[PDB]
Design a protein around this ligand. Structure first.
Ligand SMILES: [Cl-]
Lengths: 359, 360
């Protein structure tokens, strides 16, 4: 039993505290995606949707009720060792569930020194600086990575790449509240990044005399509000409801900011694939050094990594991350007419998840 | 891809506060079961064990490490809501990418009984149980007779030797036996004894004037210490390691105290089975009224239900419950040369889970 992605949508991402989604309750952010799916697929028999799976870093069960999904639909809420998309594929592959909604939601800690904005866990930030210290990534390296995120995000937005999947959030009278990723800073420059103050100032690594603190509010991802859902199902369930499969989930696997690397090696193993076989690599951008280390570890070509930008630009939506970056790849495989993407992030108490999809 | 159960072991159950496992750390209860699986299958390649999944009401990750399981084995903690250990393990194996999985749980020290101040176990849960008794017409005598039969059938199973293969004694750091039996059991229980007990829990159902409070510390299950583990795997994993499959997991499904009923109807639908096709029904005994309602709802024969006793007698081990009652059925199918059992419990923010196994 193969698991296919039939749809993958998401909310634009709102800045927390003083942004556009601050008054919108997380439930309503999730129910609006269900309502968009219904507009897209009005004939859909929801009796086949066995679970809504929500990552939150009783909303899954409450969301089912507020959306008016069937009472036969369960709610699964995830913070240990699992991930939403990975869980939905295993359910469907097991052959006892027919359609699953999988994704997550975030709605308002490490903080950047000048803006007081969440970026987002203190010891993670120190680890990030340790990685840069151990691996020899300079302040200019991590800033150059941040710049390329903002640039690729800007190119993706202005190029229309996200038009199909990014669903405007509207108020209870229909006025658009937010239709774009407002955390983006497309005016970002290397000179601007260099003035920013470092934000995170160990005995296992006893040869390190001093940590070279290089991460800031500009090369670490700010936390943003948002929701995302992926509709996963069997072949028979989708051909039942006249849905067109958009990608196949080839393999998934699971394995303190270094987790994505081995989970990626493992998923590649399970699928009988190598790095050369993957057209696009998508890794959540929690901190620039962590992405650079992943790239350095696996010899990942620059032109294949986070090709439409990542969380440094658009924001880190915590629980919603997995469904957002999956959908970003489902869409980008189609725009490129490319074949395979590998999507990976932290679960993540030290633990990573990696998933290979096929167009 | 079929999911098979290759082994199912469990700790005896310790009374909380004054009992035999009160100073045994929950981590050690789990590690002991791993070390027992090793004694049984010493040539087993643990590299095929992809996860340890533990329900508890960072212990799964710490368990993997303390047990010296491989660094490739991950930990999954269900405390992750709407999921159940054994059901999650089955689906992983059936998915085809995981070869062997350890699934179970652990409890180690709220509604209490009015006299001995034990725990039994959430106050409003007990009110719902009384409410069910009132709506359905179960008397105090009905709920007590149910408790009595739990004690009797557990007494029977224990003295008959039924649990000898699966209940693994807990031992101290010098090897002395700390606990080898289900010490919460009260085999001397009588109807006269149960009737003296004080009730513990005294607009949707606007036609009910007063709730008939019938639940006590003798017909609601006390919470106990314990751990349990089920080893689930694929056909090929078992044949590489030369393990003998004991049962196949036919189906499993998921759906305040009524959840097991629809989950059971659902699992039955998925497997293409009726109630007549099941030899044994095993439902966790949180409260006597809830077991009687399940039985009454689905027309379950008395001789098929909780046939070796349940939590009222042996104790409710919270997170360990699913693996313990699963193992109870793997053994009892074997002992009867019977074919199928249905194992069910609350997850359970209102959510029930039911799983059908078939003896292989
Ligand atoms: Cl890049």
């Amino acid at each position: 039993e193969e698991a296919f992605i039939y749809e993958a949508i998401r909310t634009p991402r709102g800045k927390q505290k003083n942004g556009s989604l601050t008054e919108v309750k997380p439930l309503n952010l999730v129910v609006g995606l269900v309502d968009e799916l219904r507009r897209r697929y009005p004939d859909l028999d929801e009796t086949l949707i066995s679970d809504m799976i929500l990552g939150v870093v009783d909303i899954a069960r409450t969301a089912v009720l507020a959306a008016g999904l069937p009472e036969t639909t369960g709610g699964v809420q995830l913070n240990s060792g699992l991930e939403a998309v990975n869980t939905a594929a295993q359910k469907v592959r097991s052959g006892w569930d027919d359609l699953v909604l999988a994704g997550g939601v975030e709605s308002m800690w490490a903080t950047d020194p000048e803006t007081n904005y969440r970026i987002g866990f203190v010891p993670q930030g120190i680890g990030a600086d340790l990685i840069a210290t151990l691996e020899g990534f300079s302040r200019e390296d991590v800033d150059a990575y941040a710049l390329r995120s903002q640039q690729k995000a800007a190119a993706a937005w202005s190029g229309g790449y996200f038009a199909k999947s990014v669903v405007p959030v509207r108020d209870q009278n229909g006025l658009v509240i937010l239709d774009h990723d407002e955390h983006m800073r497309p005016d970002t420059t290397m000179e601007g990044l260099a003035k920013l103050k470092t934000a995170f100032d160990l005995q296992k690594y006893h040869w390190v005399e001093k940590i070279n603190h290089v991460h800031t509010g500009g090369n670490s991802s700010g936390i943003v509000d948002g929701a995302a859902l992926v509709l996963v199902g069997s072949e028979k369930a989708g051909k039942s409801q006249g849905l067109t499969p958009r990608a196949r989930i080839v393999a998934t696997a699971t394995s303190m900011l270094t987790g994505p690397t081995p989970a990626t090696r493992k998923v590649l193993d399970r699928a009988g694939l190598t790095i050369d076989d993957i057209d696009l690599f998508e890794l959540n951008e929690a901190f620039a050094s962590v992405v650079l280390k992943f790239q350095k570890d696996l010899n990942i070509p620059d032109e294949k990594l986070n090709v439409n930008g990542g969380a440094i630009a658009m924001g880190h939506p915590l629980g919603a991350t997995g469904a957002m970056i999956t959908g970003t790849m489902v869409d980008e495989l189609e725009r490129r007419n490319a074949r395979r993407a590998l999507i990976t992030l932290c679960i993540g108490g030290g633990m990573g998840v990696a998933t290979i999809i096929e167009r």
